[PDB]
Amino acid sequence: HMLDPEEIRKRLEHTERQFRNRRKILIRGLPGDVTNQEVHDLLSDYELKYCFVDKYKGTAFVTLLNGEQAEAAINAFHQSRLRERELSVQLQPTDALLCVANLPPSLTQQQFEELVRPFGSLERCFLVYSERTGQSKGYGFAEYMKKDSAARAKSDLLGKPLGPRTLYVHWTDAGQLTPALLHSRCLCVDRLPPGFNDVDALCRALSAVHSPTFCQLACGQDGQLKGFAVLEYETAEMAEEAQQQADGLSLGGSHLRVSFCAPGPPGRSMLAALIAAQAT
C-alpha cells in the first residue's frame, strides 16, 4: 500500500498542476466606457492570451498564460479600483465540472483521462491521491471545455460498471474546491454481509481510529436495505486514516469494502444521492 517516494511525488505534483490549471478570469464592475486596451494596461504585469470586454455588462473575460498568473491577477485586482469603479475579480465560473467516484483505486491517471476524454476536450483532469501513500482515493475530476461534453460524460458514466465497481458521477461547483476540499470527509461502506441491519456494530468497528460524525445504513422508498452505508468524519484526514485500517476488515460473513465518496455533500446528502443513483 506504500508506493516509493518518487511515484508519490510524480502523482501529487500531477494532481496539483492539473487542479491549479485555471487560466480564465472574470472581471466585473468595469466603467461603461472601458476598452480592451485599458484592461490589457491594467493587467500590464501579466501576459494575456485573451482579453474580451462586454462593454454593456462592465465585464471582461481574460485568459492568462497559466493558473499562477491568474491567481496573482485575482489577488492584485479583486476589490481594487479602476477610475473609481470597484472591481470584482475571480476565476471564471464553469458549469462543466464532474466528479467521477467509486473508481477502482488501481485505475491510473492515464486510464482516467482515457475514460473521460472521448466525451470532449478537457480543461482539467485529475485523480485525487492520499498525500501519505500516493494511493488513489478512487475519485477524480473532469472539467470539460463545453457543458455538453460534461452532460454526455455524466449520462454515460453514471452507473457504468468498471471492474468490481459501479461508477458514481455528480456535477461539482469548481468555485468551492481548494487543495484541502479535494479530500472527501464521507466514506461508503459496502460488501456488507447480505441482510445487515444493526447499524451500531459497524459504526463502532469504524471508530477504531476516529469517531464518525455520521454513520447510517442505506434503504430506499420501499424500506428494504440497499446494501451499503454512508459515513462522515469531522476532517478529511480523519476519513483517510479510518478507511486505511477499516478496508478489508472482517465483520460477520464478509470483508467490508470502505471507499471514499465524491467530496463536498454532507453524509445525509451523499446517502440520498447514492440511493437515487440506484433508482429504477
Curated annotation (Swiss-Prot):
Where it sits in the cell: the answer is: Nucleus; Cytoplasm
For this chain the motif Nuclear localization signal maps to: 9-24
Residues of the RRM domain: 23-94, 96-174, 185-263
**Domain of life assignment:** Eukaryota
Biological role stated in the UniProt entry: Cooperates with PTBP1 to modulate regulated alternative splicing events. Promotes exon skipping. Cooperates with PTBP1 to modulate switching between mutually exclusive exons during maturation of the TPM1 pre-mRNA.
- Quaternary structure note: Interacts with PTBP1, RAVER2, VCL and ACTN1. Part of a complex containing RAVER1, VCL and ACTN1.
This chain belongs to the protein called Ribonucleoprotein PTB-binding 1
Q: Which organism is it from?
A: Homo sapiens (Human)
* Lineage per the UniProt record: Eukaryota, Metazoa, Chordata, Craniata, Vertebrata
Name of the gene this protein is made from: RAVER1
